Amino acid sequence: NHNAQALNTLVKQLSSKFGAISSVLNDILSRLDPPEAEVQIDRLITGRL
Amino acid sequence: NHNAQALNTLVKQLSSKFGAISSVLNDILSRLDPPEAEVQIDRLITGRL
Amino acid sequence: SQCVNLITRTQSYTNSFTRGVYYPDKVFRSSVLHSTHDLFLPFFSNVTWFHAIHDNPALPFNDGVYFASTEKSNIIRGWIFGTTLDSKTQSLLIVNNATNVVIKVCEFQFCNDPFLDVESEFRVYSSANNCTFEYVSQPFLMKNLREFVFKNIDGYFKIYSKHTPINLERDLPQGFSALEPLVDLPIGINITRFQTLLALHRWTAGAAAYYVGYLQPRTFLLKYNENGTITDAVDCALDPLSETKCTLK
Amino acid sequence: SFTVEKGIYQTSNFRVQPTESIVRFPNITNLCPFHEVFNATTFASVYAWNRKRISNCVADYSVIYNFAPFFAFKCYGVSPTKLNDLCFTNVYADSFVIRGNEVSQIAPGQTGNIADYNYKLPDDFTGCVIAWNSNKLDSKPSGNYNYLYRLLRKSKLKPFERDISTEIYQAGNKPCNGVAGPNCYSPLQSYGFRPTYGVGHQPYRVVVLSFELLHAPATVCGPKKSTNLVKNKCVNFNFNGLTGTGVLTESNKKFLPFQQFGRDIADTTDAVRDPQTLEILDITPCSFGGVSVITPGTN
Amino acid sequence: RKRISNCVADYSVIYNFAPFFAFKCYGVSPTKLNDLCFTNVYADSFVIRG
Numbered sequence: 001n002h003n004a005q006a007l008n009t010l011v012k013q014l015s016s017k018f019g020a021i022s023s024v025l026n027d028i029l030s031r032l033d034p035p036e037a038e039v040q041i042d043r044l045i046t047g048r049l
Numbered sequence: 050n051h052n053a054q055a056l057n058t059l060v061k062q063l064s065s066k067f068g069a070i071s072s073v074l075n076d077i078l079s080r081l082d083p084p085e086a087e088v089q090i091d092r093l094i095t096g097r098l
Numbered sequence: 099s100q101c102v103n104l105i106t107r108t109q110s111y112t113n114s115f116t117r118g119v120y121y122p123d124k125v126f127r128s129s130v131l132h133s134t135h136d137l138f139l140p141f142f143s144n145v146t147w148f149h150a151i152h153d154n155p156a157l158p159f160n161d162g163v164y165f166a167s168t169e170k171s172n173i174i175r176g177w178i179f180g181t182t183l184d185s186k187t188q189s190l191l192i193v194n195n196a197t198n199v200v201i202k203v204c205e206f207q208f209c210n211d212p213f214l215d216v217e218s219e220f221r222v223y224s225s226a227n228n229c230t231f232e233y234v235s236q237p238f239l240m241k242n243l244r245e246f247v248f249k250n251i252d253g254y255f256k257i258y259s260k261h262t263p264i265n266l267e268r269d270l271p272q273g274f275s276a277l278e279p280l281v282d283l284p285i286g287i288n289i290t291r292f293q294t295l296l297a298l299h300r301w302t303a304g305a306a307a308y309y310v311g312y313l314q315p316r317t318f319l320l321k322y323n324e325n326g327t328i329t330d331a332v333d334c335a336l337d338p339l340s341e342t343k344c345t346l347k
Numbered sequence: 348s349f350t351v352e353k354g355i356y357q358t359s360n361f362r363v364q365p366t367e368s369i370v371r372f373p374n375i376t377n378l379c380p381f382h383e384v385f386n387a388t389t390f391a392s393v394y395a396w397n398r399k400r401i402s403n404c405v406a407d408y409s410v411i412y413n414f415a416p417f418f419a420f421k422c423y424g425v426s427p428t429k430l431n432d433l434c435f436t437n438v439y440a441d442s443f444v445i446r447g448n449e450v451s452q453i454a455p456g457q458t459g460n461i462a463d464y465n466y467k468l469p470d471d472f473t474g475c476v477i478a479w480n481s482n483k484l485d486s487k488p489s490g491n492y493n494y495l496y497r498l499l500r501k502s503k504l505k506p507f508e509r510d511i512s513t514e515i516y517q518a519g520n521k522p523c524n525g526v527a528g529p530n531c532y533s534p535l536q537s538y539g540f541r542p543t544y545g546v547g548h549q550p551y552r553v554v555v556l557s558f559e560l561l562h563a564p565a566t567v568c569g570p571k572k573s574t575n576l577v578k579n580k581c582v583n584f585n586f587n588g589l590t591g592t593g594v595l596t597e598s599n600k601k602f603l604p605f606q607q608f609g610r611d612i613a614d615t616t617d618a619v620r621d622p623q624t625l626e627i628l629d630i631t632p633c634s635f636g637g638v639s640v641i642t643p644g645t646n
Numbered sequence: 647r648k649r650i651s652n653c654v655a656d657y658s659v660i661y662n663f664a665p666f667f668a669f670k671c672y673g674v675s676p677t678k679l680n681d682l683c684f685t686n687v688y689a690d691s692f693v694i695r696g
């Protein structure tokens with residue numbers, strides 16, 4: 001059960017925003033300036049790390 | 050070997066940019082506004098920590 | 099005078115082994131293993147052997163070009179790069195002789211088979227009218243094999259060159275020989291095809307042979323010895339063993 | 348705490364402080380011709396933009412404010428106030444004339460007619476952009492027609508790419524055959540400039556300055572005096588804008604003629620080439636160490 | 647307040663109607679407006695001081 005719960009929590013953690021405008025990379029890429037979308041991707045990368 | 054590899058990895062980690070414009074503090078200090086260079090030093094400090 | 103057609107060409111294929119390695123930057127390193135991602139010539143691939151004897155020498159340029167010449171009579175000199183080889187677009191006119199090299203970017207009206215009278219260029223282009231880019235420097239070409247690498251990135255044309263003595267061999271040798279940069283220019287034009295120039299005295303029968311290859315974006319692992327030179331390289335996209343070696347560094 | 352028990356404690360580290368400062372710059376005596384780039388009383392069209400190369404001169408950017416009546420700089424990789432200290436390899440100056448509302452299109456990662464058909468900037472651009480109004484010089488009561496821009500191109504332009512070919516653009520399957528009939532158009536249109544238009548439709552002169560980082564021997568930078576060279580001492584050094592502190596010693600490394608710097612495992616400069624005398628030097632950090640204090644109890 | 651719906655939006659022509667300098671957008675970028683597809687558009691207009 002410990003392993004199952006840990007894996008489930010790790011999967012569930014992917015839906016967080018971490019202070020960005022969205023939790024989906026495609027929306028950020030399609031809605032923002034390429035030189036500006038980097039500061040949004042950085043937060044997601046740091047949170048997932 | 051474990052200790053040797055850990056120390057080597059710790060030394061090698063100093064060449065990362067962590068999203069900044071450079072991995073050298075002197076270049077950032079000599080190329081940027083003093084009130085603006087702080088946001089670049091912060092990323093390096095956080096990564097090394 | 100006017101354009102004339104007098105050159106014929108034949109083709110063959112051969113292997114490249116491990117050739118076409120150049121220094122990626124002007125930084126000194128020693129006793130290290132470095133990883134680079136750039137346009138390189140893949141190991142163990144087709145390279146085309148062209149034999150010109152006296153024709154559509156407008157070969158594609160693609161990302162980059164690797165040129166190899168093993169002759170001695172100095173029959174080879176200069177190159178042309180462009181997109182349509184007409185007067186409606188600008189093109190390169192690299193020309194070499196025993197004293198100087200002249201690089202010109204204009205809207206030349208190239209002939210089907212350009213060459214040199216030998217020392218006039220009326221056989222190359224009819225005329226050039228409106229242009230800006232001109233450059234003059236020391237000539238590039240100085241039992242020996244000459245290797246050249248031409249590429250362009252972000253409007254910058256970069257050339258690498260190397261000379262190496264070779265013994266009596268009918269194919270490319272085995273080993274490693276790094277290339278050093280010589281020229282970087284702000285070209286800022288569109289390049290799709292390229293050609294080759296020859297100097298013919300008067301005419302007289304002529305023969306030449308060269309090797310042509312194409313570059314691709316690849317990741318390489320280079321080994322710098324204690325002495326500043328590159329002595330070994332590993333291509334990380336050749337076979338699973340090389341991928342494992344690159345992963346393990 | 349005000350009381351210490353018996354034991355040994357690690358307190359701090361000792362280091363050796365520098366003695367003086369060293370500056371080494373190459374022989375440059377000419378002045379960069381920034382004057383001729385501005386006040387040229389003739390600016391090319393956006394679709395055919397001029398490009399001037401600046402090298403082997405001393406650059407004084409502070410005088411640039413005296414040539415054009417612009418408001419402020421717009422730099423990306425550097426700061427306007429720090430331009431007098433850095434030393435580059437080559438400088439490139441581009442100049443053209445555009446409309447008022449298109450000035451925002453001259454920036455990395457931009458999209459628009461001018462961005463993809465006339466002038467494109469790389470996503471890693473390092474330079475400055477200076478734009479200023481020129482309504483008193485490029486406007487006529489009847490309407491100026493000497494400035495043109497390209498409308499339709501088959502593909503998007505690459506960074507720092509120029510297009511001059513004038514043809515008949517085809518929009519259908521039938522060939523144009525060099526006539527401007529249906530589904531065949533001209534590729535260039537002229538701006539309509541009048542002095543009675545709004546601020547967003549008035550002509551604007553734009554100059555872009557592009558710099559090159561230190562990869563080759565430097566040629567362009569400001570008037571900084573060069574001092575003598577000292578060795579075997581803990582000193583501050585400044586080699587072509589590369590600043591640091593340490594001890595400089597003679598080097599036994601065999602640099603290739605096209606190499607100028609030496610790096611180590613941790614990506615730090617450890618070998619340098621003097622700009623004036625082509626000599627190789629090694630840099631070593633000054634002496635340092637750790638200090639421990641041994642004491643019994645304070646009672 | 648005007649409601650805009652059931653039409654093809656070409657924002658690039660907006661620069662030809664008013665002599666403004668530049669856009670000021672918050673949730674999106676001005677250059678990416680030609681790719682996104684919304685549900686409703688609302689336009690408000692008034693006059694204020696500088």
Ligand SMILES: *[C@@H]1O[C@H](CO)[C@@H](O)[C@H](O)[C@H]1NC(C)=O
Binds near residue numbers: 111143144
């Ligand atoms: C090279 O190309 C030829 C024809 O394009 C092909 O038959 C051959 O398999 C390729 N590879 C080698 C090693 O010859």
Ligand SMILES: *[C@@H]1O[C@H](CO)[C@@H](O)[C@H](O)[C@H]1NC(C)=O
Binds near residue numbers: 198199
């Ligand atoms: C080589 O070409 C240059 C370029 O025109 C010319 O000035 C020079 O005289 C040529 N060399 C000889 C030996 O003619």
Ligand SMILES: *[C@@H]1O[C@H](CO)[C@@H](O)[C@H](O)[C@H]1NC(C)=O
Binds near residue numbers: 228
């Ligand atoms: C160059 O191109 C321009 C524009 O197409 C044309 O007017 C001119 O005649 C051409 N030749 C020269 C020498 O300027």
Ligand SMILES: *[C@@H]1O[C@H](CO)[C@@H](O)[C@H](O)[C@H]1NC(C)=O
Binds near residue numbers: 290
């Ligand atoms: C460059 O020339 C080729 C050759 O026709 C063309 O297909 C391409 O669209 C041009 N532009 C770019 C950016 O490649």
Ligand SMILES: *[C@@H]1O[C@H](CO)[C@@H](O)[C@H](O)[C@H]1NC(C)=O
Binds near residue numbers: 325601
């Ligand atoms: C290193 O270079 C020096 C330069 O003369 C040479 O004497 C020496 O043999 C070289 N050593 C190796 C291992 O290449």
Ligand SMILES: *[C@@H]1O[C@H](CO)[C@@H](O)[C@H](O)[C@H]1NC(C)=O
Binds near residue numbers: 385386
């Ligand atoms: C240079 O620009 C200044 C602007 O104040 C102008 O007065 C001067 O005439 C210009 N010099 C020329 C056009 O030679």
Ligand SMILES: *[C@@H]1O[C@H](CO)[C@@H](O)[C@H](O)[C@H]1NC(C)=O
Binds near residue numbers: 373622623
């Ligand atoms: C630069 O000038 C100094 C002083 O005149 C001279 O000693 C030095 O040789 C010069 N540098 C070069 C590379 O000629």
